[PDB]
Ligand binder design. Structure first.
Ligand SMILES: COC(=O)[C@H]1O[C@H](O[C@@H]2[C@H](O)[C@@H](O)[C@@H](O[C@@H]3[C@H](O)[C@@H](O)[C@@H](O[C@@H]4[C@H](O)[C@@H](O)[C@@H](O[C@@H]5[C@H](O)[C@@H](O)[C@@H](O[C@@H]6[C@H](O)[C@@H](O)[C@@H](O)O[C@@H]6C(=O)O)O[C@@H]5C(=O)O)O[C@@H]4C(=O)O)O[C@@H]3C(=O)O)O[C@@H]2C(=O)OC)[C@H](O)[C@@H](O)[C@H]1O
Length: 342
């Protein structure tokens, strides 16, 4: 039993359809009854902010139904101010019980073309984060099935509550899954991208940059997945599994890297190609304005039964026991929430 409240299409000959996804979402009655939108194949150049609870998008196909926009953190607004990382997102989820199925979400900011620009080019952006999907503190219970997320730096920003990614593709370079949310990934392809701008022997990127609060039980949990290189040109030992993001945060005594954002990333039963070297450190600014380094050994970085060429076991790559691994089931990670589609 599946029925649609609204249909989005590129064709006028399709029938009683909306031309834009934003229009279809806006047409939903105020409230929290389920609202399900079918999105027919096409590229929809739109930026969306979801504020209605119990909204559900279903694409005709992951390959063919695309929601895309090009926005970097350093892209300037009309008033001349920057969008910023949060502000750069193609899709922002600020409601509960959202789901998306069988669609692609892209940030089309051309990171490689930006980096290839001459240093004196005033159009060359320094703030190169460009978010495809952002789940905010107001999104809890967000479910993404058979979804592809496309970007380079900061592709997926998961904050606040619980999100679940299933049968997914996520691509990027630097910190491409990051934030303080409880985010579970099952049967996903995590695709590390080629960096034309990085010298041989330097780091090309980091899969994760968790900012999980120390009192929060679960951060980024990746299960039954595949950690893969985009191409053979992605060098061996060029990508970190994670580095600890301690976000600049406003406190009573100033604005500086959050000491209690001691991130968790756990990989269970996940394949890894040899582009992976292990975990890494990350820097921020402390309460005095000095550089401060946060180390992987002080963070909640673990693996369980990784395989493939990138899966070395060493003192620098901590392993869960069987008993500890049992704590990372879908049931335990997501608690009372069972992700379901309409
Ligand atoms: C004025 O107050 C209000 O009205 C509201 O405030 C709230 O919103 C806050 C905040 O004000 C707002 O700006 C925003 O902030 C987020 C984030 O929370 C901040 O910590 C900050 O993050 C930046 C950056 O945007 C992130 O992408 C990330 O970047 C890291 C590195 O720090 C950065 O240097 C860079 O890495 C380089 C290099 O680019 C890379 O290639 C590689 O070589 O590594 C380098 C390195 O330095 O290591 O990129 C990294 C990355 O991509 O991950 O962290 C930064 C940081 O920690 O400073 O800014 C963000 C933003 O601007 O969007 O949202 C906040 C919020 O939502 O609060 C929870 C309140 O929420 C609201 O209630 C009002 O009060």
């Amino acid at each position: 039993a599946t029925t649609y409240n609204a249909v989005v299409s590129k064709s006028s000959s399709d029938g009683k359809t909306f031309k834009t996804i934003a229009d279809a979402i806006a047409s939903a009655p105020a409230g929290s009854t389920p609202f399900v939108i079918l999105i027919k194949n096409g590229v929809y150049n739109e930026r969306l902010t979801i504020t209605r609870n119990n909204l559900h998008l279903k694409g005709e196909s992951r390959n063919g139904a695309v929601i895309a926009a090009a926005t970097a953190a350093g892209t300037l607004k009309s008033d001349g101010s920057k969008w910023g990382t949060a502000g750069s997102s193609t899709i922002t989820i600020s409601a509960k019980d959202f789901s998306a199925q069988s669609l692609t979400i892209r940030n089309d900011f051309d990171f490689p073309a930006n980096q290839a620009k001459s240093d004196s080019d005033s159009s060359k952006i320094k703030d190169t984060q460009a978010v495809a999907l952002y789940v905010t503190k107001s999104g809890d219970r967000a479910y993404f099935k058979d979804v592809s997320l496309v970007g380079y730096q900061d592709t997926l920003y998961v904050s606040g509550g619980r999100s679940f990614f299933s049968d997914c593709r996520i691509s990027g370079t630097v910190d491409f899954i990051f934030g303080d949310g409880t985010a579970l990934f099952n049967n996903c392809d995590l695709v590390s991208r080629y960096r034309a701008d990085v010298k041989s022997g330097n780091v090309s990127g980091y899969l994760t940059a968790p900012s999980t609060n120390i009192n929060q039980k679960y951060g980024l949990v990746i299960t039954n997945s595949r950690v893969i290189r985009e191409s053979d040109s992605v060098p061996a030992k060029s990508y970190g599994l994670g580095r600890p993001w301690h976000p600049t945060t406003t406190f009573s005594d100033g604005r500086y890297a959050d000491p209690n954002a001691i991130g968790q990333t756990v990989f269970l039963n996940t394949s890894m190609d040899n582009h992976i070297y292990g975990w890494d450190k990350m820097s921020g600014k402390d309460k005095n304005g000095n550089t401060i380094w946060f180390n992987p050994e002080d963070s909640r970085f673990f693996e369980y039964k990784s395989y493939g060429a990138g899966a070395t076991v060493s003192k620098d790559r901590r392993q869960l026991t069987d008993a500890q691994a049992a704590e990372y089931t879908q049931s335990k990670v997501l608690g009372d929430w069972t992700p379901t589609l309409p």
